[PDB]
Design a protein around this ligand. Structure first.
Ligand code: ZN
Length: 572
């Protein structure tokens, strides 16, 4: 590398460069309007084109953070812009806002959108990136490019359809659902790297890829872990151009040699660049090879265990996890990492003592309770889900987690508990030998969100403990939280329980959030009421809404009949 800017302009290409730069600025300055970033991205692009012509031109020598940050600083920001590199980039990164409280964007009419798509395609698609990047500062940048590709394809197709709204809206809504999920899933990776370190990510990545590619050798898996670690490190540090290039190259590497890795990549490697990576990242598990011995020979019984461990602890323990993860796709990543830490801690205390086998021989016995514990949670909560349904299952978990940590803000409790309820719809449909991976690694994402949303405004000593103590053990920690006894009941507030005619016109998603926001506030006001008791109060609520939405005058029904609800409720 002689001049870093131009180099990335050739590798990635103008379309992707411009995109990735727009995403970079959007994530760092989330409050600034669209027209400002467009001007900055344009000026970097035009600048990069001079460096392509001449790598010896003025300022092309500078680093990408310097080039990016100087350009943002022509525009929170005033704090960071006082600084030099690299502390400025750390500032910018610290200043990322998870819930920026931008308005949930209202979509124009489909006829209006398809006009602007044809008349100004470049603008229309640029504004998509902008708006998603702004609300999801931790979004996997190369992924978001693929989202833009899908979003583009949607209009090319549905704008030339007989019915446009019937074509377009279910595609765009489906796409927004994936976005939120991807975003949350990626927010975990960054949190893992940034709060727990590069070992956490490396250990995570060994487990996940070993499960995925069991016919791959250890040395082959360890390479893909190094490459995948680098890619997310760079993406989570704001090196978006370098992340996307390195990710692209890890995809060409894999696809070149599927034989060394897996048999499931036949279809993925016959796809466009953006879609290619997505496919690999989300590929099914390859068939575990049949001729695999017991793990106990090399790792429990052998006479050179402490010898091979002491020679290379991270090599050896990486092999353990490799060997254990490749033959247990039924286990969750985070379950596997507990066992890798259980086996780690055994070898540290016991290689020291002069009787090594006597301790080390009965290690696998320690795993038994760690494997049953998640399986018990999934069997039980999926039972509950299948019995109630998503909405009521959310309502139950809402009561559960509010009773656990009633100090947490109501938007967070409601958003988290709602997303905890979605595990049921995602994972319980699958069979028992494929449930824990789905479920427990989803809960990792959703709990990380509680942690992240809570991190900025900490009001719960329990949530801080469970979030900080161990990345791997979080779900056990949170599950183990019994109902809080210290909590003083919050005093009745008439604004919280005064509802308006607005409720009738809303969506089914939007409607039930409001009702769930009440149910938390009920649990916050009256925490000693049972799960049965509260049902009867929310019963009367729903029927009150129902009759006032069929009213001639809706305004007056919601005001007058509403106060009789709060009177009758507060009594019981
Ligand atoms: Zn960086």
């Amino acid at each position: 590398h002689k001049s870093e800017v131009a180099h990335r302009f050739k590798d990635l290409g103008e379309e992707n460069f411009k995109a990735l730069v727009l995403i970079a600025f959007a994530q760092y300055l989330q409050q600034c309007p669209f027209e400002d970033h467009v001007k900055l991205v344009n000026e970097v692009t035009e600048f990069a084109k001079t460096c392509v012509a001449d790598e010896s031109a003025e300022n092309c020598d500078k680093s990408l953070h310097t080039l990016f940050g100087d350009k943002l600083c022509t525009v929170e920001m005033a704090d960071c812009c006082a600084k030099q590199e690299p502390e400025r980039n750390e500032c910018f990164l610290q200043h990322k806002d998870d819930n920026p409280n931008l308005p949930r964007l209202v979509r124009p009419e489909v006829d209006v959108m398809c006009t602007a798509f044809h008349d100004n395609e470049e603008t229309f698609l640029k504004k998509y990136l902008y708006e998603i990047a702004r609300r999801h500062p931790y979004f996997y940048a190369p992924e978001l490019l693929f989202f833009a590709k899908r979003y583009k394809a949607a209009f090319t197709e549905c704008c030339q359809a007989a019915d446009k709204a019937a074509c377009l809206l279910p595609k765009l809504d489906e796409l927004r659902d994936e976005g939120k999920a991807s975003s949350a899933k990626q927010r975990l990776k960054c949190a893992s790297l940034q709060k727990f370190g590069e070992r956490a990510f490396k250990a995570w990545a060994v487990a996940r890829l070993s499960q995925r590619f069991p016919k791959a050798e250890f040395a082959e898996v360890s390479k893909l872990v190094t490459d995948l670690t680098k890619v997310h490190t760079e993406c989570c540090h704001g090196d978006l151009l370098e992340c996307a290039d390195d990710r692209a190259d890890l995809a060409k590497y894999i696809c070149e040699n599927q034989d060394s890795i897996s048999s499931k990549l036949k279809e993925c490697c016959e796809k466009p660049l953006l879609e290619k990576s997505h496919c690999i990242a989300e590929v099914e598990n390859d068939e575990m090879p049949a001729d695999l011995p017991s793990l106990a020979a090399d790792f429990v019984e052998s006479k050179d265990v402490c010898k091979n461990y002491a020679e290379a602890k991270d090599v050896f323990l990486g092999m353990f996890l490799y060997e254990y993860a490749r033959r247990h796709p039924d286990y969750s990543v985070v379950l596997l990492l507990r066992l890798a830490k259980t086996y780690e801690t055994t070898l540290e205390k016991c290689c020291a003592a002069a009787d090594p086998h006597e301790c080390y021989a009965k290690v696998f016995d320690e795993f038994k309770p760690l494997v049953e514990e998640p399986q018990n949670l999934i069997k039980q909560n999926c039972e509950l889900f299948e019995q109630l349904g998503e909405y009521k299952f959310q309502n139950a978990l809402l009561v559960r987690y509010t009773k656990k940590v009633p100090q947490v803000s109501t938007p967070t409790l409601v958003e988290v508990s709602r997303n905890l309820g979605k595990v049921g719809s995602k994972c319980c449909k699958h069979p028992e030998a494929k449930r824990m991976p789905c479920a427990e690694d989803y809960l990792s994402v959703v709990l990380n969100q509680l942690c992240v949303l809570h991190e900025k405004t900490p009001v719960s000593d329990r949530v801080t403990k469970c979030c900080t103590e161990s990345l791997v053990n979080r779900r056990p920690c949170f599950s183990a939280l019994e109902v809080d006894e210290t909590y003083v009941p919050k005093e009745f507030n008439a604004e919280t329980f005064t509802f308006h005619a607005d409720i009738c016109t809303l969506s089914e998603k939007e409607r039930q959030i409001k009702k769930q926001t009440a149910l938390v506030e009920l649990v916050k006001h009256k925490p000693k009421a049972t799960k049965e008791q509260l049902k009867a109060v929310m019963d009367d609520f729903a029927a009150f809404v129902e009759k006032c939405c069929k009213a001639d005058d809706k305004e007056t029904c919601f005001a007058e009949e509403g106060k009789k609800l709060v009177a009758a409720s507060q009594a019981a």
